[PDB]
């Protein structure tokens, strides 16, 4: 898959499991429209979000429902969710891995782009 | 100052200067309405975005224009911007400091919440 | 393997490859002694550092030669290296993954402990 | 103040108070020699660790006792401490700010280097 998502819990030191993830693509009128979604596996990963044919150039937004994740663990969260917005470009073969590291009042997100 | 934003450059190890910042508040119709904007100073900090009187309860979005920052220095970043969304003042007024650490392909954001 | 290491470059957005990694164990006299070492693969990972029998409880230090990594890319680094010190405990099955995200003047390290 | 250390709590979103900090300088025999120590205040900052006159060239180690911090609040952390090692003043005197963001199983450290 050209687009992969991996979430980690910095508090417990483990993958963040069963975390809802929504992907959106920016439409011609600048509104966001559903593209893909799913929940992280037991490894904190979410694969098979899309395919090469479907994944065309453009601006994409990846939304991670961190709020629910924390509520579920009985921990008070600051953010409503963790957003990641980027432009997918066909500069040769490219796989996109959006890595997110979570804490109740802080999160880190990194993009690993490999060929 | 109830809402402050601080940005650092992780590559250079210095304050990220002139970083444009846009704040939005979710309207009673679920669309993002402009609330305030500014640019970081030489210390990488942005003060005076709003006031206690005007900073009411609500869901806020702090948009840091990271892309313009990196492009402004010959670098082609991954993210379009960094957006921090959170509910504020739902337990009474608080002072919020939104910190962001920037790298071309990665960013970190922390929120420091204290009382007045 | 009970101990794994993964390094990412936050500047280029890819795994940090061919990065030297040294593991040490704290001896009875508090000095650090060689335990294991290697260089990250093309995936930015370093496996097979040790085995269950060898990996006993105690205090371990994982040293990542980030300085060389940056020098090699013609980029000026701040830190001499990135250290990670922790206590390995036999609280039931445990695999240790030390994740490091690198930037010239900043680094993040997370420990993913799974069963 | 040529060397300052700031620590934040990523779980709570507040300054990490009373965090013990030990600084060492590599001696001409490759062993770590005590240079200075202190604890973070209520703002999570530690000032006055050393002076311009005493902070000479060298390889320094800043040891932040994260474990004691987390244990002091009923939490069993992963790391023993966070150690920041770096060469300082090799291009003339600079002001260094070592920042650290703490979580029970993870930490981030950034170095801000500026001129006087």
Residue A68: exposed, middle, or buried by beta-carbon count in 10 A (0-12, 13-18, 19+)? middle
| Bridge partners of residue A88, in order along the sequence | A58
CA distances from A91 to A56, A57, A95 (A): 12, 10, 11
Of C101, C96, C47, A76, the residue nearest D78 (C-alpha) = C96
Give the domain C1-115 fold: Immunoglobulin-like (2.60.40)
Distance, C-alpha C100 to centroid of its chain: 7
Give the separation between CA D76 and CA D81, rounded to whole angstroms: 12
Q: Are strands C3-9 and C95-103 parallel, antiparallel or unpaired?
A: parallel
Tally B–C CB contacts below 8 A.
37
- C86 in Cβ contact with C60 (< 8 Å): yes
Tell me the Cα Rg of chain C: 14
Chain A positions touching B112 (Cβ under 8 A) are 105
The data reach a resolution, in angstroms, of 2.3
Chain B positions touching A103 (Cβ under 8 A) are 110
The 3-state DSSP class for residue B70 equals helix
Q: If residue A21 lies in a helix (H) or strand (E), which one and from where to where? A: strand A20-26
Residue B111: exposed, middle, or buried by beta-carbon count in 10 A (0-12, 13-18, 19+)? buried
Q: Are strands C3-9 and C20-26 parallel, antiparallel or unpaired?
A: unpaired
- B83 in Cβ contact with B5 (< 8 Å): no
- D58 in Cβ contact with D25 (< 8 Å): yes
- Nearest-10 Cα torsion for D68, C58, D85, B109: -60
Give the separation between CA B54 and CA B35, rounded to whole angstroms: 9
Q: If residue A71 lies in a helix (H) or strand (E), which one and from where to where? A: helix A66-72
Three-state SS for A51-74 is: CCCCCCCEEEEEEECHHHHHHHCC
Please name the residue that has the structure tokens 């979570």: A102
Beta carbons of B110 and D8 less than 8 Å apart: yes
| Vertex D87 angle, CA B19 and B14, to 5° | 5
Give the domain B1-116 fold: Immunoglobulin-like (2.60.40)
Alpha-carbon torsion A103, A104, A106, A107, what sign? positive
Q: Are strands B14-15 and B106-114 parallel, antiparallel or unpaired?
A: unpaired
Give the separation between CA C84 and CA D82, rounded to whole angstroms: 7
Q: How far apart are the first and last CA of chain A?
A: 12
Beta carbons of D104 and A78 less than 8 Å apart: no
């Amino acid at each position: 898959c050209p687009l992969m998502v991996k979430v980690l819990d910095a508090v417990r030191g483990s993958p963040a499991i069963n975390v809802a993830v929504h992907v959106f693509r920016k439409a011609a009128d600048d509104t966001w429209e559903p593209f893909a979604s799913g929940k992280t596996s037991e490894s904190g990963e979410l694969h098979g979000l899309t395919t090469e044919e479907e994944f065309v150039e453009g601006i994409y937004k990846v939304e991670i429902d961190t709020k629910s994740y924390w509520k579920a663990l009985g921990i008070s969260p600051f953010h409503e969710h963790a957003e990641v917005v980027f432009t997918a470009n066909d500069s040769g073969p490219r796989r996109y891995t959006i890595a997110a590291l979570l804490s109740p009042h802080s999160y880190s997100t990194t993009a690993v782009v490999t060929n």
